[PDB]
């Protein structure tokens, strides 16, 4: 369960994070059928790759949601650093295969609007981490 307990830790990390910030306001990686972590069309290889990559894209959006504080800098720092541990864990199961500046030109093009714009990033991260915990629990 060093993988269920993990995602959940990070999930509870986001839950506690949304709060410090949802208390003032008040094409991100996503899983498809072809990604195969889906009982039907299951390829443990197409998806184990899908997680690491998605987790790797998300794990760079939290390098904005860092210079986006510092009232809860470790709750903010721990989410980033705990995700790096999750990536390493999944890479250890995997076998290599999959850009920050893409997401820089892209995270500007998209940009309370700076919370509205943090909400979906963390909600989409919550949504993805759910789809991975589900994906993993079967394999």
């Amino acid at each position, epitope marked *: 369960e060093r993988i269920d307990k993990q995602i*959940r830790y990070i*999930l*509870d990390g986001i*839950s506690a994070l*949304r709060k410090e910030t949802c208390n003032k306001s008040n094409n991100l990686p*996503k*899983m498809a*059928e072809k990604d195969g972590c*889906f*009982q*039907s*069309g299951f390829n443990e290889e197409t998806c184990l790759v899908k997680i690491i990559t998605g987790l790797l894209e998300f794990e760079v959006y939290l390098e904005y949601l860092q210079n986006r504080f510092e009232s809860s800098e470790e709750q903010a720092r721990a989410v980033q650093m705990s995700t790096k541990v999750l990536i390493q864990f999944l890479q250890k199961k995997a076998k290599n295969l999959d850009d920050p500046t893409t997401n820089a030109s892209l995270l500007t093009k998209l940009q309370w609007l700076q919370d509205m714009t943090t909400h979906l990033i963390l*909600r989409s991260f*919550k*949504e993805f981490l*759910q*789809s991975s*915990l*589900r994906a993993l*629990r*079967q394999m």
Partner: antibody, heavy 122, light 109 residues
Framework: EVQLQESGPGLVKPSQTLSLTCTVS??????????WSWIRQPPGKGLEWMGV???????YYSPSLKSRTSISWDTSKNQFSLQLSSVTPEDTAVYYC??????????????WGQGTQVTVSS | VLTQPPLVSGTPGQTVTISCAGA?????????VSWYQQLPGTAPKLLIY???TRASGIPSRFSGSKSGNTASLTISGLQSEDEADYYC??????????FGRGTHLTVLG
């Protein structure tokens, strides 16, 4: 005398909206890792999942039932309410409130829910 | 679209099967096939969840199965009180739940 209770009406007219509310008892709404669902049942027909709100407070609706449906909540009163816009006599149903014991590893409902009847009529 | 037979009859002794035919993006892609029993005038009661896992208190005779995108439900030994409406449910991507029409179980004889 502990439940998951639904509030009325009752009687709703076509142009009007549906402000149904469920009151959670014996358990906080804000707890890991629950999801709060609205499920409806027409006079003689089958179960219809309307939408959810998890412990985070993020909503998910049925693709046909969106635009019309909006699910709210009040953490202080330990409640979660449903709103159906522009009702039709197709919305005449028994409205259920239900708990998902863990939102992130299932879509099965253990604690239902009891139902309020809601018929649409001029 | 989770297809269940409208009606299913049963020997007042034993045994019956209720099918829940789904698709790739619901029953297929996960194992969230949950079953519910509903007696008239009351709310549905959870029997099975995660295709096979029986709910706490539910008898041994209530069995859960799956082949592909079709889950089935078995009631091994019929009591005259199993006469109810049986509903299947599944997780459809992303963060949705879908139910079948239902299956009326008639205990006969």
């Amino acid at each position: 005398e502990v439940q998951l209770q639904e509030s009325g009406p009752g009687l709703v007219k076509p142009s009007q909206t549906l402000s149904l509310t469920c009151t959670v008892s014996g358990g906080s709404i804000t707890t890991r890792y629950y999801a709060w669902s609205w499920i409806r049942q027409p006079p003689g027909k089958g179960l219809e999942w309307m939408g959810v709100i998890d412990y985070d407070g993020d909503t998910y609706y049925s693709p046909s039932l969106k635009s019309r449906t909006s699910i709210s909540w009040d953490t202080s009163k330990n409640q979660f309410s449903l709103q159906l816009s522009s009702v039709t006599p197709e919305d005449t149903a028994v409205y259920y409130c239900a708990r998902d014991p863990d939102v992130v590893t299932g879509f099965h409902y253990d604690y239902w829910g009891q139902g309020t009847q809601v018929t649409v009529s001029s | 679209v989770l297809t269940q037979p409208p009606l299913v009859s049963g020997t007042p002794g034993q045994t019956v099967t209720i099918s829940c035919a789904g698709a790739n993006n619901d029953i297929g892609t996960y194992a969230y096939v949950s079953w519910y029993q509903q007696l008239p005038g009351t709310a549905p009661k959870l029997l099975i969840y995660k295709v096979t896992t029986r709910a706490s208190g539910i008898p041994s005779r209530f069995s859960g199965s799956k082949s592909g995108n079709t889950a089935s439900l078995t009631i091994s030994g019929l009591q005259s009180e199993d006469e109810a409406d049986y509903y299947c449910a599944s997780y459809r991507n992303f963060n949705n739940a879908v139910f079948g029409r239902g299956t009326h179980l008639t205990v006969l004889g």
